[PDB]
Amino acid sequence: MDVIIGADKDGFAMKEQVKKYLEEHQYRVADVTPEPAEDFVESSLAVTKKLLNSDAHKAIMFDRYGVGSAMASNKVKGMVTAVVEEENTAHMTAEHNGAKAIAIGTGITGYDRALVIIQRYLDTEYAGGRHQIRLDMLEKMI
Amino acid sequence: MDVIIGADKDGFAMKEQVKKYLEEHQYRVADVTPEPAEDFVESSLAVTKKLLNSDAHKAIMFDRYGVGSAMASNKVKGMVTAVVEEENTAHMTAEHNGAKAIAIGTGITGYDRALVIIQRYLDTEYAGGRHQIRLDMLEKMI
Amino acid sequence: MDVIIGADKDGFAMKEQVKKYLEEHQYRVADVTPEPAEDFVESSLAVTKKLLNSDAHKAIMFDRYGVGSAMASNKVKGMVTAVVEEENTAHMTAEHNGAKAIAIGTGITGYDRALVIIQRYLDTEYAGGRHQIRLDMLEKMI
Amino acid sequence: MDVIIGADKDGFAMKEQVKKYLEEHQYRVADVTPEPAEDFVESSLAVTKKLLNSDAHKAIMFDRYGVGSAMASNKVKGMVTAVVEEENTAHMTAEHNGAKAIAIGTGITGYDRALVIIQRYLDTEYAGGRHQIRLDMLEKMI
Amino acid sequence: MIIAIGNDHIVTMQKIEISNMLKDMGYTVIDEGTYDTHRTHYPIYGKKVAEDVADGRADLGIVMCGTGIGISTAADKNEGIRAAMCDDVTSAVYAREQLNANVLGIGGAVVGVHLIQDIVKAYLDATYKETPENKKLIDKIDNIAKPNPDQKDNPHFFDAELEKWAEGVYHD
Amino acid sequence: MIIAIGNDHIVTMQKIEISNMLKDMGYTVIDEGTYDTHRTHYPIYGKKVAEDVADGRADLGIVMCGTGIGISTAADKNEGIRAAMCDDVTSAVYAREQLNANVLGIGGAVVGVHLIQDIVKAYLDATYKETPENKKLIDKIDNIAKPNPDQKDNPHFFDAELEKWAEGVYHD
Amino acid sequence: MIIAIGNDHIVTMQKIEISNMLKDMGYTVIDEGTYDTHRTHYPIYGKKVAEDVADGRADLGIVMCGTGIGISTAADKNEGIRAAMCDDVTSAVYAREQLNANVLGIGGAVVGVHLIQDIVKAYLDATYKETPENKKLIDKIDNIAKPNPDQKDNPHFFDAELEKWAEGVYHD
Amino acid sequence: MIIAIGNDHIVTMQKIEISNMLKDMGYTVIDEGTYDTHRTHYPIYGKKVAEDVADGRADLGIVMCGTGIGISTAADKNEGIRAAMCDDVTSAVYAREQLNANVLGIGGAVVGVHLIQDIVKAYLDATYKETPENKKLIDKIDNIAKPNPDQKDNPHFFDAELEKWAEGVYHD
């Protein structure tokens, strides 16, 4: 399973840790920000582009609050990014929203919790079915 | 205002950051763990002992998950420790439970959120009134 | 206290029983249908006219289902008629709506229940206060 | 379909009307009280005995409030009598409780409504299934 | 078929239950009544529902308040409306079949949800059965009130009362 | 005064409302009925409430289920109990004044909370008034059933049924 | 000040709580979100709220769904909107002070009502404070999407999807 | 497995939801917490739950109040108990796996139901993994408090405070 990761200056540290974690667990990681991005807009849009052009369906964005990477990346037509700070949304957003990426706020979420969030997100598959109508609606928007 | 703080090996880093924060904000801090404690049992009981034996009414314990320091310190008769991971309990536990201390898990809560939590806890006074019946009940237990 | 009553062919029997009841209980009754009215439209409007043109503030309309007398009399500007089949509305409609009259359907409500309903309605005064805004709105409508 | 009916002095009148109604609708009626029973205990127990000894599964008891016929008849082992004063219970008690009989209070329920109640009760079949456990429990009691 | 529904703050939860049922039954719903449980005034939503029905935006209406008296009375006081206050199936069916009532009122605080569902279904299932007798009754009913062009389709009709309420004129 | 209350899963929320009201009125409440809304069986709780009243642990009892019929009937089928099924204030007052009913049953899903409150209040406020007539009726009622010591105070009385339920014997 | 609020069927009750609070605080509320709990789709209401804010009908917007992710994302995908998904007070205050977010999204099924109240209050109480840094960020964000006039102010935008839903195309 | 659960009046509805889930999952539940929503005191139910677990009547406990702090602290202050206050899955799993916590506390007013369900399931699914390291920690924790024979299994322990409350000693 491929995973696209990216981060700005505030999220870089955790991104580096998560990268190590992912590699240790046989995940093929595509880091779009070997060096911290100028800001969360650059990092979030970079992850989005790599994701929407790759055959990967999992991505993780890192910044100080998460809010920014999602706000910016969601402006991209077809993109669906979920800010995640707890363990229920971690999997539900993948199951129902097919979230193409999740955003983690390093100033909001501690490392140990982030890992539980991340692993739950990665282990969950989009359920499709009735949920597809909402996804069709979102991908239709600007 | 006075504030008692302490931490084990896992919470030491954030404890040091917060101490500096509190000092910059005119708070008189009493650090009972200048060097990281052996574990959260030693750090929490140290904070508790210094608190129950001082004119201070607020304390912050730092460890990896918060749970431990709370579980341990709450065993001490008369002590009331609240694990805090969000901004509502941050003030409600002081208002309602007159929490003598709050426990923050560095692996659970990010630094920026921790500061909001801490500031809300410090700016909130115990309401007393009907709430005293519950504190009287708690202090009566082991 | 004063009470205005009236009924059509279907509610006449109970109306006669209640009149006797009210008389035995020291109530001054004004029967506007000594002989059964042509229909509930004539009986309800007769009660309404006599009520809106008297110093009485309570009236009871009798017909087969209650609905008709209420639907008809409520068309008169300023009138408020409540169909009543149970003991809670019996007093609440007077307290809240200052109901000028209640409508009882003889094919719906048994005589014993009707008496409890009636007595609860007669013993209850309009509360006024916040409730007046709603009566002011109603009296403003056709 | 057979229907057992009975009534005391207060319920006799309606019982006579319902009897006529039932006959007009091809129902085979077994009236256990050609003359009003001494009281609701006698009439309710008479209906119960006739029902539990007959192959009929529908019965109607009449008295002033209904409450009494049900209270008394339910003391009989195996009997299930439902006081009914509205149109939802009219069918639900048959569907879920398999109510062997329904009790109608002539002082509580008007004739037109009683008929709707009665017809809904008669038109509904016991659903069995999960409901049977509750019926087994009731028939087990004194 | 389109059903307009309205309510005051006391029975919003009951209104939600009925709204859900109607949709499951295939009805299109126009929810006019209050959407939350903040203190408000039943005449507002009663009038809104009445006008949807009178203007043809909805085929029938259902209104509820604690007892149903207030909002159903408000609904009745509108041109083209015949509002039936019914806390029982029997009179609701009568209301539809005989008086061709186009607005049903129910006391959401005195009638249990299972029975409310029954009243609504029975009222909707019923069909008006015209006769010379009920037509004369209905015609009389439709001609009792004196129309007011200032009320008909006027959304600012109660602005006067609302301002007073804001100013605390209606304190307890 | 002590009031025992019980219920099945369909009306737990209505039970909670009545429980709060009773305590606000100064009554001591013994909640027996089911505490959550997980599917269960009305006879279990009706029997619990009945024995509380019969054994003197409570002065009066109140039971509810969707229609009230199931739980009130279960309550009635116990020694020393006179359970009255009342969805109205009138029959409830009669039950207390004339039959000295010690257990009140109400249909939580058919009666609105405001009216349930009224029924409960009227029932509690009423006082039994002995007369040669109702004394004779009460005597007859108290002697209809045949006491069964195996049921009396036996909380495991329905175990056979509960096991069959666990084994799926009562599937739909 | 005017606040537009919306939601999907999963959190209608949480929406109602926030609606009551906003009005108690003196805000004027425009409730767009679904009014009952019948299964519906979060993008419909997220878009409604977004356009209210974008067109000036409302000053700020608040949207919620089970996790908040769906409705907040739908809200963000509109011209003139900067929607912030915040299940905490800290990121919510940041959203307002630094990104001048005009729409707040919350997970009604993952955040407790007391904390939801706190988030909403903190968000509203916060004030945007321009800085050369956040002005540059806001500028970038406002220029990422490509405006689509066919979507802007078009309430029938999701009709194709709604029809397919009616035809059973989205079965599970 | 038997799970004892308790709560104060603020989160009875959340407790009901968890109680329902546990039963659907096959757990036997002992509901100790308050059954309605009448103002009461969290220490009472925290102590009740703690003792069920300590005496072996239940295998594990779950307690909830608005923030969970009060009731979980009460639960922890009992012999044989290791109460873990967790509003997140991560620390709950840690609590079980490392500290062998036998009582889980959650803030029913700050955590949404979907997340509460997740915390509970995760805590129950987790298994204590003993090591020399955590055994030393646990042993230290179990030896901090000084036992009080007057508290252990004493149902009248808070009678003193309850009487004062009745006398209005604890007024606002």
Author numbering:
A (entry chain A), B (entry chain C), C (entry chain C), D (entry chain A): 1 to 142
E (entry chain D), F (entry chain B), G (entry chain B), H (entry chain D): 1 to 172
The authors write:
D-Galactose-6-phosphate isomerase from Lactobacillus rhamnosus (LacAB; EC 5.3.1.26), which is encoded by the tagatose-6-phosphate pathway gene cluster (lacABCD), catalyzes the isomerization of D-galactose-6-phosphate to D-tagatose-6-phosphate during lactose catabolism and is used to produce rare sugars as low-calorie natural sweeteners. Structurally, LacAB belongs to the RpiB/LacAB superfamily, having a Rossmann-like αβα sandwich fold as has been identified in pentose phosphate isomerase and hexose phosphate isomerase.
Initially, the structure of LacAB was determined at a resolution of 1.96 Å using a crystal obtained from microseeding using the hanging drop vapor diffusion method. The LacAB interface has a total buried surface area of 2069 Å2 in LacA and 1895 Å2 in LacB, representing 21% of the total surface area of LacA and 28% of the total surface area of LacB, respectively. The interactions between the C-terminal α-helix (α7) of LacB and the antiparallel α-helix (α6) of LacA create a stronger dimer than that established by the RpiB structure. The Superpose program of the CCP4 suite did not demonstrate any structural differences in conformation between substrate-free LacAB and its complex with Tag6P; the root mean square deviation was 0.12 Å for all Cα atoms. The other vacant and shallow site corresponding to the RpiB was consisted of entirely different residues from the active site, and occupied by hydrophobic residues Phe-40 (LacA), Leu-99 and Leu-137 (LacB) plus bulky residues Tyr-65 (LacA) and Tyr-94 (LacB).
